[PDB]
A paper describes a structure:
In this paper, we report on the crystal structures of both oxidized and reduced forms of bovine PrxIII F190L to 2.4 Å and 2.2 Å, respectively and examine some of its novel structural and enzymatic properties.
Twelve monomers are present in the asymmetric unit forming a toroidal structure. In this higher resolution 2.2 Å structure, a detailed picture is revealed for the first time of the precise nature of the ring-ring interactions stabilising the catenated state. Interestingly, the Cp loop of chains F and G of the reduced form had to be modelled in the dual conformation with half in FF and half in LU. In addition, the new Arg123 conformation, together with the lack of C-terminal structure and the dual conformation of the Cp loop at two specific sites suggests that our structure is not in the typical fully-reduced form, but may well represent a trapped intermediate state.
Author numbering:
A (entry chain K), E (entry chain G): 1 to 164
B (entry chain J): 1 to 163
C (entry chain I): -1 to 163
D (entry chain H), G (entry chain E): 2 to 164
F (entry chain F), H (entry chain D), J (entry chain B): 0 to 164
I (entry chain C): 2 to 165
K (entry chain A), L (entry chain L): 1 to 165
């Protein structure tokens, strides 16, 4: 279930990883931390700020054994086309994080962030620990992006607790 | 599941029409022939040929009182972004037909062309008469494009059969 | 599981056909390992049907050349098929046939393929391209009065092969 | 359908004098009807009996009796068999109605349909002016019946209703 | 069942054969053609002409390997009494065919010819082949006579088919 | 309404031979009179006639006490007439002073509980039915044994006496 | 029960030669049996018949036939009625068994029980050596039957077996 | 209503011998009086008469205190009268000052819960029923053993006193 | 319970010769038992019958018959009534067992319990050596029975086993 | 309506001994007063009188604060009276200043949750019930142990103090 | 069940013992008497008087093999902080008895003292013997405190019974 | 439901507001933004930092039309006692925000943050708009606190969207 202290719902799908298509799953992240976050749609004005900021600070998450993965109900083909749109035209440009396709909408559904009527995800974020346990979640309404720095601080606060 | 001689399932959604977002529905085509065709996904290499072929020959359909509407499970932002990608670059360029978004997937479901596992449409095509009745349908597997010329021919053939 | 739908296995069928002026029982199993075009038409001795059927018979060897058999089906008996065959083309008939004319006398084949109109008791003009593994790759259905392009059907059969190569 | 019971309803398209005409049991109210079935157009076992009924048709008409032949073939098949000359195994011109039972419901309702192959046994019904069955007989597929015997029976039922 | 191409319903009963009581059944006729026909009642005047005609023609049937059996719901004692009444007195006089009693009415019921209301048989006729398969059946309403010659023609016609 | 003593006699209707003619009769026709209703198995057999002939010879003796006699079997009324027209020398019934009722449908024997379903004929039952239609007496014999007619008359009188005193 | 069927089982206490004895249907295999019912001990309507069977009992024995009288009274009422002299309206000495049907089951299984008043009609059954009913007759309560006729029938049934 | 102390006595109706005459009597006949209703197995048995005779001899004492006594068995009323008409010296009942009630259908013995169905006779129950039909006392003996008439009478008087105070 | 049927089993605490003793129906096998019920200790209606039974206990014992009185009172109430002098409305010394039916199940199993007030009707049961009920009688609450008559019945039942 | 603090006391009604007489009492009679309702297992046992006597001796101290006291066991009211009439010297109650309620049907002990079903007597429960019939305090002791009367009066006082202040 | 004579319901949870957190459960008290009492809430003005009186007298319970445990639905962190509040300021100060936390409310529920609406316990007290059997219970409404001396007297009286009669 | 875009579930309970006990509910905040946040337990080392940070910055929320309410499963008496403990000793000190008591646990349950096992809330936070619609929620595991500046920035971002785009 998508609640804190419970194991994260299993997921699998096609992601853009480094300009390439790869099938990824929750299993691939065992033994690291994972920030899994959702955004409504590719090619919309409100999303990319948050997605880019995550890409920019990705190295910082890697440094503490934390992976980052952005998800939307769009196809992996739409993801790539948007990654190949340069930031100066409201694209994403190169990405340091995976762009998971939730084309079936099942991932968003499993994480309790899918809006069924229009068929797209709220802005959910989950911090998942090395055993697949959810330590933190937050959800924002569509117009509002989150602070990437606060996410990083939380990953660190969680690791600190584990270490002590 | 839709069938020749049966009324076409109702549909409504956001289309890109002449670079802009418009709400469209089956009712908007009463009094006219409609070609409604589905393709899998935006930004794939198997589809632009068919969609481009249809857009190029669109006025020929307009001349015989027939609209053309292309449909995929992509959002209408994906549609517009693909329209705003030059053909030389593998995009759609300017479109003379509507591109309807089936984001909820319910239109593909209703037309019986939704593949539920991957969550995208088979290449269905439906010719619907001025009364909403399906005169012709065909469906191809994902990789294979159809002939626009043959679709135009069938339309005129159904019109000939009125007289 | 078998259904007259693209990506699904074609429903089994068996019946009496006219094959080279002779009665032969044939079935879906006879066509395993090759492509099959199975198409339905409403009725023997109607003016709307022979153009399409003759066009397939005329192109039959081009279909065989790309590993594709062609089988026409109506709900008429095999005796009707044979009489229409033995009516020359100059006389409104089918004349010589290079394809199988399957009888669906019980109408069950049309039913299983989803093209039977029960009320009047005949098929719509459906066509199914079935691959060597028995999987439907393409289907199309016309209302009764309208013939289809045999050229286009041949091009599609070629294209499905091209794509699996 | 047994003797002393009312004839099942039927309706269908018939070839009547080279033309397509919708006929039904009700068209025969007030007249005798010989309704007989044969298995299939264009088979060699059937034409001898159908032609014999055609040849002797006015003799039935003379005693207020109509003759209708029925098979599960379409009316287009019936017409092609009429347009085949007798010398060529055809029916040639007909003085009796050839009824099409394409749906098979008529043969089903008259109790003569063989479901497995989907064709009718060689059944014959004598139906009085009120639509009551006075007589019935059935032969296996290969064997034709005596027309003069059927005429004799018609005349004998008429004799009995008069005396 | 009593339908063309089906096997004839099994029957058994006491018949009058050449002035004597003999129990007969459908199995007795294996290897032979059988003409099995029904009439309504003994000692009535409408039934007799048909029956005498089959009797006078019996040898023509025997010559083509065919038996003839007349059936009514009467007892076998009635059948004998009727056979023992000279024709000149309106009886059947001597018979060359079997007269089978259907006292229980079960034979006429099984052959689909019994009028339940008065409990007598319609005039039905069945030609049954050597395997017990019905090839022809006909049922006239109670008064109307039928043709021995035509029944003979039909028997021969079925045999012709069986041979060529 | 059952074939049992103290109960009303089951209704009956059928064609009888009366004075050599056909007439439909029924239980109703005997209201106000006593009736002897008796059953025998089959016309034109050698065991039934003594009883029937004996009831006929003694018939006026029953009439003298306001009592009718009706004989019943499952034979048709045509069989009944032919047997009456067969002389007694020849095993027939000869002239009859009593009605011979036909129970062709077997339903009268069934209603009177005398029908043997196996062979489809009546046991030798006898019922004495009062002027109210009430069964005062029944007996039933196995097929090969005949009844004393004089005992039946005495029983009728006995019942009348009891009523009268 | 009916003629040509096996007699229903019975068992009960009978007065036999002035002693109580348990008898049953099994005791009479090999012999004929005349089993008859009367309404009630000590009523003026019954003794005549019962007496007549007693007087004639030797004749029945001479033809291998037993006679048993049955009523729903107890065997003590039977004995008391036997010990009542004939002039005083009793039965006096008996040559036949007098079976008590206290439980009413015997009258019930023989079809002669009047349920309302709880007593038997006057039925008589002739039962053969195999326990099969050959004859039955039933009288309303006031009317006695003929013992000579009953004896005639037993003899006639014996003649039919022997020839 | 049930055969239980403090409950209303079950309803009964049947034919009794009353002063050598047949009379139909019922529980209602006894309203406003005390009623001793006792059962015994069978007429003409060696055991029973002592009890019954003892009750008859003492009957007037019961009357003096407004109490009726009714003996019941499953015998017919004809048996009862024959037993009455049999002198005491011979094992009979002789003259009777109490009613002898027949329960030929056995329903009275059933309603009073004293019938043995297997043998079809009553256990020896005795019920003291008050003027409003309420059971004040019951006793049941096995078949062979008789009852004290004197104690029954004391019990009637005891209840009468109590029900007044 | 009815005559000819086995007495229902019972067990409980009795006052026996001024002491508390558990007794059951099993204890009376091979003996006759008179089991009688009375409504309540310390009521003016019951002592006469109880005292009379006790006064005649030796006469019962001499014929191999035990006598047990039962009420729904506790055995403590029974003992207190025993220790109350006869002069004062007590029972005085008792030659019979006084059985307590505190749970009321004994009275219920013997069919004498008045459920409304929760006390027994005056039922009496003569039980033979195999525990078969030979006699029962029941009186309404105000009326006592004759001890003499009970004794006579016991001796009569014995006479019948003994002779006929 | 249940035996729990803050709920209304279950309704009761029964016959009590009150000043040497039998009176019908119920929960309703105590409306507008405080009520101490206590159970004990059995009359005439050595273990209960000390507690009952101590309540009786202090009864006027409860009266003075508008509080009634009633003892309850499953004994009849006739046992209760007889135990009152037994001197204290002989383990009796002697005279009582409190009501002794009879719970002969055991339903009161049941409704108050203190009935031991197996032996069919009450545990030593006590309930302080207020003028509106609401339970303020309950307590239960195993059979062998008596409670302090002073402590029950202190609690009654304490609940009254809380009501006023 | 929380009924006298029944085994006490099992409980487990975190208590403050001697200024420290310890898991305790019913099994810990095997061999010992246990007074388990409940109070509504930490930091309210009603409870501390009883809790403090129990702690002051704890040595008298310990001297007769008896533990005392106080329970409320508060967390063990509240308990500790109440202990760490001076008595001067309505705190508990030093405790000689354990303060059990019933944060899930399940213990007050299992002991029948949970008020579900507000989510806190009535003032129930249970004396549980060395085998885990409830010998005595009591329950007061929220505003009234019990006498500790009387609880100690009961523990002693139960031990007296165990050792003699 | 506690999901973004849905209406916040109704709540009502006792809060400490400026050192006094006050009943508050969701209705009280209509027309204002509300930050409703949950913490596990009063008097724990883990929570005060975040509670104190919200209180220290309360005036920044007030100035953008936003109230802040903290919630736990502790009673309001524990809340008040934690307020009256000095910060130097692990206390909350003076609070500028309301501390809501969730003693029944129903608020934590309705907001989907109650850990049923231990009976305390996870660290959930909800930003609720003036119409009662949830705009943002976050939940942390028990040991980790949130940034109060990030909560305030979100309140401002939602207000900004509402005012423009």
């Amino acid at each position: 279930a998508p609640a804190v202290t419970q194991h994260a719902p299993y997921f699998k799908g096609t992601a853009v990883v480094s300009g390439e298509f790869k099938e990824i799953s929750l299993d691939d992240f065992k033994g690291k931390y994972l920030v899994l976050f959702f955004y409504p749609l590719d090619f919309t004005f409100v999303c990319p700020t948050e997605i880019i900021a995550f890409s920019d600070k990705a190295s910082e998450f890697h440094d503490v054994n934390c992976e980052v993965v952005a998800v939307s109900v769009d196809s992996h083909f739409s993801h790539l086309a948007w990654i190949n749109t340069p930031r100066k035209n409201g694209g994403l440009g190169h990405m340091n994080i995976a762009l998971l396709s939730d084309l079936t909408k099942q991932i968003s559904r499993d994480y309790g962030v899918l809006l069924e009527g229009p068929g797209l995800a709220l802005r959910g974020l989950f911090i998942i620990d090395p055993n697949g346990v959810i330590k933190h979640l937050s959800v924002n309404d569509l117009p509002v992006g989150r602070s990437v720095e606060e996410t990083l601080r939380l990953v660190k606060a969680f690791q600190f607790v584990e270490a002590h």
